[model samples]
Target chain A: SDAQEILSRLNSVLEAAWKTILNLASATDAAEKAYKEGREEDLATYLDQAASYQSQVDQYAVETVRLLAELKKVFPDEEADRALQIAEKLLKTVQEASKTLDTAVAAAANGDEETFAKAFNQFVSLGNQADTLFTQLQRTLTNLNKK
Target chain B: SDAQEILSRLNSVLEAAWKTILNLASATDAAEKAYKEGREEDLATYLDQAASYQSQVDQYAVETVRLLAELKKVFPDEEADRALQIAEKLLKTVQEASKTLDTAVAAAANGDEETFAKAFNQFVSLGNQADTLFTQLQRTLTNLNKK
Candidate 1:
């Protein structure tokens, strides 16, 4: 019974984790590509996508928090709170990253190409924070299950 | 100026697109992994995550639809409607996939491994549709911007 319950919830968290992380990688990859291209259109596309996603991530984090809390209640020993905290960090990171993305967009808007370019680079890198945190969370889950 | 405006709004759409699409991919990947492991608990975890994400996706679609409409109005020449249609298709596809994921989870809940397995395979394949459609949309945007 413990094994079954463990499998069920761990799989659930990991399932969403991979999806979120992969997309983070892909989206940032695109964003970086666009920033390097120098065409306003491409950069705009990348930034816009990033901003939209970051907001959703913020919203989704709420549910993740909820889910993790539930998991903790259901399984007192698995350390669901760590995962929840990771999710919270991502939410904050995404918010910060989106704001950075906006500043970059605004820089581009002002015709300050260099500023915008630098900002874009920063935004792309920041995007990976969510991925990194989630990956860490994944490893945590894997290790937990092993125990 | 019109180009700038179009870029701004279209970029917004792309921003969310990456987030939503990436999320979709991540969530489904988890489901596939769980199903293959032959552990109902794990399967349930994946399924539960998928189900939760599906709800968020449904809500996020509203913003995407709005962005598409704005893009269409701004760049009437680029056939924004086509891109919008693709977005629509992805929404529909994601919904269906989520439903399939639910059924697979239900099977696991009942301890019907055979049914769960079959449903999960179908669910995994269904998951790909979102990425494919999103890729298609990305290209369309790139091409549109080139014009």
Candidate 2:
């Protein structure tokens, strides 16, 4: 139940960030054009980047959600642990990451690139670190299948 | 016309890349297992990263493809130049960045950080540049009004 709640947070954050990022970017984009010069260009560019960042996270979030949901549905009341490991980890990370993103955007809006960058780098770094297992797993599967 | 082709390529390439990334990650993960490793954790991490990278591009690709698909339905021929300007920039830039990513991965695999960093950096830079115009336009319309 706690794990599921975390997954829900991920879903909600992704959807929220998607809309917020787009709205902010579009508004500033128009502001830049009409006013010809102001804070708009900077704001718009940041929004664009932020949205892209969020989108990347969302892709993972969605797949993770589906994977967790599927596993739980398929393998409930199993032998060993209370719930699935992979699914639990997936949900936990998504929840933590979503909170970080909320703060990250606020920092960015305040022109705190250092804070924003710290958060941004964290997201990318975590994303990168988390991915290694996925790759290793694939190679193993391919080898087995090939055999 | 060119924009249309670019958009199409963007969509196909991105989707292919994302699927490959995730599936490969998951496959490799299944290979390496500790005695007490979870079945899903047995999945490779590197493969996941590959999927993550592809997903980054796919985010842009999906946005561009869906945007173009919807826009073409009610596009004003008179405003074609402006609209197309944004579209071409996004598709061309994303495609260009995608190539950089492909090259960077190869470079990294070959143990050439210089080439890898250069190419990877270029990809990120281009991707950043491309997002501004397209994202702004995307946000402005909200959804295609068909007006």
Candidate 3:
């Protein structure tokens, strides 16, 4: 009974969350590209761009939690460990990005071009990591559907 | 039987409308905040933000209509189909934004901050359906009061 309820709830939130994910991913990618464009010789400029991109990425992370919480509410009966694991893992990544974004922003503001450039590259990779994580989550969801 | 049909259709459509509203609200808030931080006279800057908001708003509006149409197909009757009125109103707003958002973009690019802000703020005001459930319920109560 709990499994069925959980499945139903997951199905309900899936469409919206999935759509949001696509939009957020695209946004982060665009932000990344925007930051990369003004970079060549000056690491400071690159870092400054990284700082802006990180802020947007952080916003995405917060929304991800909100959406997941909505999912938990919708599927109250199914207290599966896998769902918790996924949420926790994502939360950690989101938090990490938030921290990195803040640090990058500070470095850029301080005119530490090298630090900023370093942070921008790292920030882009973080986004790529998030995309990969979601892809895995999607596969897990499909498996759950089959089960 | 008529009341049952109405209630059922309303239930399905309301969920979509609510989600669309949330997306619109969030997008508007983000754009407005960005606009305030951005320099004046850069109309294109504001227009970009409006476009983002419009895209999300349009998406949910499309989803709402698709759901409403599906619900109508499932239950064919005028008695149980009043949610269509609200959905239509919201969709009209969405369609209007789609057409004019481009003009706002042009103005923004041309450095008309005034036009950009006007369009952005106005979008926040037009066709609010997040309060539709309460609005409809209140109207029904008023009708009963007169009766």
Candidate 4:
């Protein structure tokens, strides 16, 4: 029953994670669009939005790490261990994305449009990597559910 | 200049593709939430949303195929060929998600909650795979841009 409860909670966390991913993607898109159009005000607005999303994702990663620790405690099996490894990778990917977003924001602040654009591209790429890890985590949980 | 133009267009397509992916994820999440809460009206609404998103992804894939053809034509090199292969895989992954979403929708329509939940899980799994492919496509495009 504890395992089931943890699985249910993990599902909720995963859902929230996807929402954060969507928000980050939208924020980056709007920021880049504003930058391209030379809308200084809107660019700053989207950059702020992106920063907020980055923090939310960072918080989500922290929460996931806690959940993962609980998972390891309850199961202490290969599947749970695998899930922990995946979560670590996912959190790392999130950090990488967050760092890239920071670079984009700095580039915008400094009027480095080309660098900002490149950073935005890398952020999207990192987001996709995070999505893959999230999916892998889901699959691992499904396997754990079987046991 | 042609390569540059194509890369720019590819970037736009990738942005649009991510928007569709976000919408699909939200639709599926809402549908599952509604189904769990026994809200028949909301479930139907979200199912319709999911179906619409699926169609959007399908259209995006079709457009991407055309773009891939154009890309191959413009630069018939190894990079373009690799990009084309990634696009093909991405399209296939999109198709898989679409099919799984259909299963979920059908199960919901038939009032089969158990089957619906299983199908939802699989749909999310396929979506993550698609996201990875999308990322790979982006990276390949970046490499192509260098040429």
Candidate 5:
């Protein structure tokens, strides 16, 4: 029960982050559709949605980091330390990923479609990496719960 | 037509790379399940799958870097430069992500569950970042084709 309880506590912040990530993914899909269909107006709305979610994702990342640190204090074992270390890496990766996305947006706003596209690719790639990390985190936590 | 041709070329490598990534994800899921259920044999199979695909992924990444460089040579402009820059980032990110995954596997093998778990989380995080980057890359490429 203690293992399960600890697992749930970790999930609190992670669940919040995933919700934002999923929303951001949907927003990305919508934005792509708008752009492809030649509907600037529609694209604008999607972009706005994405922007809002992106901010939420960042906030969630920050909260998750804080929670990880607090969790470490509760479980000061070697295993917990390892998870925290990964958590720290996850935070940094997400932050860097977010910066690239911002760069893409700024480039787009400045009318540099070329750079915008490039930066956007970098952002998207970073997102992919982040997604992988989160998935592993979930899997690891789930396994711990079962144990 | 030229953009279409470029898109096709890009897709060739991209599709190959994605297959490897998805396979890796599936293998990860299987491993997690096996580990939880205490199925050492099943876990070994999953690990084998992961290892095989890992080599393939690394190969695809190399091909992508080469292709991107060639693509840049063909275009040679601000747009191309940006594309190349992003492409480079994509290559590096994937490589780093792979290394993290390898670290996790190694830790797991060494019986350092704590470190193993943390490394796995980092790997997952990197994967997520890569997913985002791939999405943007597709979007940007589509837009380029339209232009």
Candidate 6:
């Protein structure tokens, strides 16, 4: 049950992270809507909220990485290795998404419409990729548990 | 992004289902603890809560199966088929766990200590298996998204 305990912790942390990411995505979207509607104050408020959510996600990502390292040490088998590899990839994907989101936030704050548009598009793309990677990592971990 | 949309809906529904399952597990644990401590009223209350959560999980399970079928129709590829297969297996594992939980609840209500003990053990085992299968399904779905 030791491995199970670690995995459970990892799962919970990842769940929390995903919730924050979703929140961040919504906040970003709200900010974009506000900007397009010429609601400057609302745009600023939404961007601030989005930034906070992004920060929370970053912290969760760090915790996830630490947990994955511990998990690898606990179960050094091929299955465990595969799970770890997928988790790492998932982590990288999420980090990229986070960075892209940050860029979008910055561009919006600077009122750089062209830059913001490009960054926001990239952020969305990265977010979709991250979502896919997250699911893959989850599946890999489950397969590992069967071992 | 039709397939993505369907998958997203499925993921959210499954997430809700898992949360209820976790709640049910905790409630069952509390009930068992109450029984061991001879707190009969507390045991009854916890058991009631556990039963309610189990019912919620059952509803979510039905919703999940419905979504999985929808997701299959949205992305009728080999990858989607594999994801559907894993999801079906995961659903079965969770259903078995739910049934085992129900048995434990019944035994506890009947004051059958021996039966309750055996059912509780089985419940835990089944819960672990379900967790593993859930992860596998999530991974398969993510891989399908890549295609």
Residue-level lDDT of model 4, residues A21-42, one tens digit each, is 6656656666666677887866
Q: Interface RMSD of every candidate?
A: 6.9, 16.3, 12.6, 9.2, 13.0, 16.1
Candidate 5 ranges beyond 4 A from true positions: A1-147, B1-6
Write model 2 residue lDDT over A1-147, tens digit each, in one string. 444454455346444433433332223233233224444434444444445554555565455456445535644544212223543454456555555655666776686767865775565455444444334323432332222
Write model 5 residue lDDT over B38-88, tens digit each, in one string. Answer: 785576567657755754665555455445555665666666556556665
**Which is the leading candidate under DockQ?**
1
The 10-residue segment with the lowest total lDDT in model 5 chain A: A102-111
Give me the chain B TM-score of candidate 6: 0.83
Q: Please name the candidate that would achieve the greatest TM-score relative to the true structure.
A: 4
Better of 1 and 6 by DockQ: 1
Candidate 5 per-residue C-alpha lDDT over A1-147 given as tens digits, one digit per residue, 9 for 90 to 100? 254455676688688888889999998888778767877546656655775576566555544544455556666666666665666666556756655665554443333568867877777888898888778667666544565
Poorly placed runs, candidate 2 (over 4 Å):
A1-147, B1-81, B139-147
Model 1: DockQ vs. true structure: 0.05
Relative to the true structure, candidate 5 reaches a TM of 0.47
- Per-residue C-alpha lDDT of model 3 across residues A55-76, encoded as one tens digit per residue: 5545544554555555556565
Candidate 1 per-residue C-alpha lDDT over A1-147 given as tens digits, one digit per residue, 9 for 90 to 100: 354475466567557545554444444555565556665665565556556656666565565566666667767764667766776786677777777878887887688988887887777677777668766766765655654
Q: Tens digits of per-residue lDDT for model 6 on A1-147?
A: 377888889889877776566556556666667778897756666666667887787677677777777877887777777776777776687778778767877887788978878877887787788778778877776765554
- Candidate 2 lands at a TM-score of 0.34
What tens digits encode model 2's per-residue C-alpha lDDT throughout B1-147? 454554455445544543443332222232222112533222223323433555565565556556565546545443433554566566676667667766755764575657855775676577557657555545433333233
Instruction: Tell me the TM-score of each prediction against the true structure.
Output: 0.46, 0.34, 0.39, 0.50, 0.47, 0.47
lDDT of candidate 3 at residue A49, scale 0 to 100: 36
> CA lDDT of A144 in candidate 4?
75
lDDT of 6 by residue, B3-101 (tens): 788878877877777656655655666666677889775666666666787778667666766767776786677766776676667667767777776
lDDT at B64 for candidate 6? 64
> What global local distance difference test value does model 4 have?
0.79
Q: Which ranges of candidate 1 are over 4 A from the true structure? A: A1-147, B1-10
Candidate 1 TM-score to native: 0.46
